[PDB]
Amino acid sequence: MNIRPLHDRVIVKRKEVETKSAGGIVLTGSAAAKSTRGEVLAVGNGRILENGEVKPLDVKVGDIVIFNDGYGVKSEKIDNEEVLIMSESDILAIVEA
Amino acid sequence: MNIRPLHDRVIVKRKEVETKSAGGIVLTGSAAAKSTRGEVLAVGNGRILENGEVKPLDVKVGDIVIFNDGYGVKSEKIDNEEVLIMSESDILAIVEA
Amino acid sequence: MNIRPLHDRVIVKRKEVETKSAGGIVLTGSAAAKSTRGEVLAVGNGRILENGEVKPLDVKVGDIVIFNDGYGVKSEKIDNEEVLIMSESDILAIVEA
Amino acid sequence: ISNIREMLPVLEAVAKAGKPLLIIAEDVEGEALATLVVNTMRGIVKVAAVKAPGFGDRRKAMLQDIATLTGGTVI
Amino acid sequence: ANSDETVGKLIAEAMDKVGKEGVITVEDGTGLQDELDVVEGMQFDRGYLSPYFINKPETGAVELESPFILLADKKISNIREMLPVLEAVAKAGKPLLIIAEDVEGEALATLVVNTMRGIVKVAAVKAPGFGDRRKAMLQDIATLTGGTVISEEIGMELEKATLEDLGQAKRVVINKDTTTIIDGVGEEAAIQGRVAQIRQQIEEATSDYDREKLQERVAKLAGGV
Amino acid sequence: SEEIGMELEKATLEDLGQAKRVVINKDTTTIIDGVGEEAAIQGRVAQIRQQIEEATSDYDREKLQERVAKLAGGV
Numbered sequence: 001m002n003i004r005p006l007h008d009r010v011i012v013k014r015k016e017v018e019t020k021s022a023g024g025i026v027l028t029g030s031a032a033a034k035s036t037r038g039e040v041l042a043v044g045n046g047r048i049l050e051n052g053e054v055k056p057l058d059v060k061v062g063d064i065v066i067f068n069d070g071y072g073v074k075s076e077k078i079d080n081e082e083v084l085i086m087s088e089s090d091i092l093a094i095v096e097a
Numbered sequence: 098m099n100i101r102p103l104h105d106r107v108i109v110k111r112k113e114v115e116t117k118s119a120g121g122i123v124l125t126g127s128a129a130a131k132s133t134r135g136e137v138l139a140v141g142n143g144r145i146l147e148n149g150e151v152k153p154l155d156v157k158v159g160d161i162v163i164f165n166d167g168y169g170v171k172s173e174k175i176d177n178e179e180v181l182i183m184s185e186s187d188i189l190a191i192v193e194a
Numbered sequence: 195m196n197i198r199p200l201h202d203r204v205i206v207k208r209k210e211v212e213t214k215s216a217g218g219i220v221l222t223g224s225a226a227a228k229s230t231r232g233e234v235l236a237v238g239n240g241r242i243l244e245n246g247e248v249k250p251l252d253v254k255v256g257d258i259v260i261f262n263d264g265y266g267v268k269s270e271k272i273d274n275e276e277v278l279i280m281s282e283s284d285i286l287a288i289v290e291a
Numbered sequence: 292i293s294n295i296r297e298m299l300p301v302l303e304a305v306a307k308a309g310k311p312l313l314i315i316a317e318d319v320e321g322e323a324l325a326t327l328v329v330n331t332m333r334g335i336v337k338v339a340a341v342k343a344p345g346f347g348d349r350r351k352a353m354l355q356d357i358a359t360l361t362g363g364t365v366i
Numbered sequence: 367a368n369s370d371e372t373v374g375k376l377i378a379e380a381m382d383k384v385g386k387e388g389v390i391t392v393e394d395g396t397g398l399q400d401e402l403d404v405v406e407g408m409q410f411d412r413g414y415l416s417p418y419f420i421n422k423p424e425t426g427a428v429e430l431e432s433p434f435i436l437l438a439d440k441k442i443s444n445i446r447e448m449l450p451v452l453e454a455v456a457k458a459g460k461p462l463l464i465i466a467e468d469v470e471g472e473a474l475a476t477l478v479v480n481t482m483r484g485i486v487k488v489a490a491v492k493a494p495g496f497g498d499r500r501k502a503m504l505q506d507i508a509t510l511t512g513g514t515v516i517s518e519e520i521g522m523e524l525e526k527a528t529l530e531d532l533g534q535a536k537r538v539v540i541n542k543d544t545t546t547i548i549d550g551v552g553e554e555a556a557i558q559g560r561v562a563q564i565r566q567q568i569e570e571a572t573s574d575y576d577r578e579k580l581q582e583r584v585a586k587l588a589g590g591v
Numbered sequence: 592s593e594e595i596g597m598e599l600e601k602a603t604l605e606d607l608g609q610a611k612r613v614v615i616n617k618d619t620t621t622i623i624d625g626v627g628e629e630a631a632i633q634g635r636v637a638q639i640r641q642q643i644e645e646a647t648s649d650y651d652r653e654k655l656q657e658r659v660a661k662l663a664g665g666v
Contacts, residue, residue: 029476122303
């Protein structure tokens with residue numbers, strides 16, 4: 001079964017922990033760091049704040065995103081796969097092109 | 098591939114760490130400090146706050162800016178180049194003339 | 195080249211560090227203190243807060259001002275001269291008369 | 292001395308004067324000493340750094356001796 | 367040697383090989399007979415920091431063919447500072463020796479997996495000496511290999527070094543206890559100049575110790591040990 | 592080895608060793624007849640065998656020929 005995030009919350013999945021390519025050919029072995037990129041899997045209706053109306057989120061299902069991995073983000077297990085739950089406030093940009 | 102900042106967030110690149118010129122001719126060697134100047138590379142639609150409407154940002158793609166390097170700012174790697182992600186709130190001025 | 199502060203922010207320059215005159219004739223030598231007075235050099239359009247409209251600042255280019263030197267204020271170098279970047283919130287009064 | 296900062300105003304006047312400069316301070320360390328190296332290593336200024344002769348209240352007395360013999364003012 | 371013809375002969379032999387500015391030391395032997403060792407070229411008391419880098423399991427030693435040499439005055443801990451340089455060497459084919467003040471952390475660790483795979487061929491060994499002697503000696507190596515000492519002291523970043531600043535050698539031999547540079551590029555005139563300068567540093571050596579170490583170094587840079 | 596850039600998590604059946612049988616009590620573990628690539632055993636033996644040759648003392652001689660016995664003959 002899949003997940004339904006509760007308005008404003010976005011469900012994403014993380015990407016490759018220091019992919020061995022940076023600097024060019026050098027296979028930069030893990031330096032005890034993580035990744036900030038991720039794939040958007042589910043989206044909530046949108047933030048309800050300020051009563052009047054409920055604004056949609058600017059990220060669609062399937063976007064590639066750079067986020068800020070702070071407190072706001074939570075770790076969960078769906079079908080035995082690593083997924084992240086943060087609000088749009090924590091999503092900083094989208095990688096396109 | 099390039100980056101698409103998520104409304105209100107601005108994507109900039111840093112400039113020269115204590116350029117050896119200050120004081121006049123003296124090549125002021127690095128005193129363990131950084132730089133606050135930077136080039137604007139990408140802009141988000143704009144802050145959505147207060148529901149009603151979405152206001153644009155006052156910085157355009159390609160501006161030279163003085164910012165406040167605090168917590169708000171984040172470090173990322175695009176095509177293997179050092180880039181910074183902060184909101185307009187952290188941009189203080191534009192260097193022109 | 196000169197500077198263009200980003201709405202609400204004000205660009206000022208500091209004044210004389212314990213000018214040796216206080217108390218009357220006595221040349222009060224520096225007691226390890228600073229100055230709070232300064233000249234306004236540049237002004238931003240004005241605070242954008244609360245969406246609707248953008249209110250101007252009550253300080254004009256060239257004012258003499260007493261400010262609160264706290265965290266809000268930042269130090270920059272323009273043409274190799276000491277300048278300060280704070281918001282109007284930090285400006286307390288204007289010295290006139 | 293520990294910071295290049297305090298030097299710049301003076302260091303500058305000497306740089307645009309051509310003549311080299313000896314510095315006899317209480318001590319020179321940190322990035323001050325370090326940058327001074329790269330400043331002569333390049334040919335920007337010619338500048339020496341040597342500790343003050345003596346220790347305690349004797350030092351300042353002796354440092355003044357030097358001022359007199361060279362017509363300088365003890366900062 | 368109380369009429370010991372063998373001692374006479376061995377000394378005579380040694381003097382003949384290390385030359386006039388070469389050092390001769392005596393120590394306990396393993397067996398019953400006297401033995402003379404002569405170290406050729408330059409070698410210092412330094413083992414590999416990464417034992418998982420031996421590229422010849424037969425001798426239990428590293429044998430880098432015609433490599434670049436990175437001299438770092440500061441100690442290394444982060445792979446970061448390497449990347450710009452490490453890269454230029456990777457796309458050049460030639461291997462690389464690194465003689466820093468020290469190599470540890472994930473820097474040392476990743477360097478292993480970088481040769482373990484065949485991305486780059488890179489060695490890591492501590493700096494010869496201790497304190498103000500180290501930098502003096504580390505410079506000796508620069509001269510013999512035509513490299514520039516990347517000294518964090520004199521306003522230099524490890525990151526901003528290019529192929530330019532790297533030393534070069536014909537071959538390098540490193541085991542658990544000693545590193546040996548075989549025939550470095552070494553601008554001929556710049557060698558004997560740096561030698562005639564250290565040669566005069568012994569002249570004004572204000573004791574016996576600042577005399578010993580100096581003529582040791584000359585031997586590593588000139589004749590033999 | 593977590594040292595040489597390896598995670599325990601990313602190991603598969605591939606990396607696992609195998610044996611005919613294993614005997615473990617409160618004091619000793621015993622591996623009875625492991626898969627052991629014949630050529631890779633005696634090679635790893637002839638390599639440790641020469642590690643004793645250049646053993647710079649008596650202790651780095653003892654432990655080595657102990658290990659060879661565990662990998663070659665018996666104890």
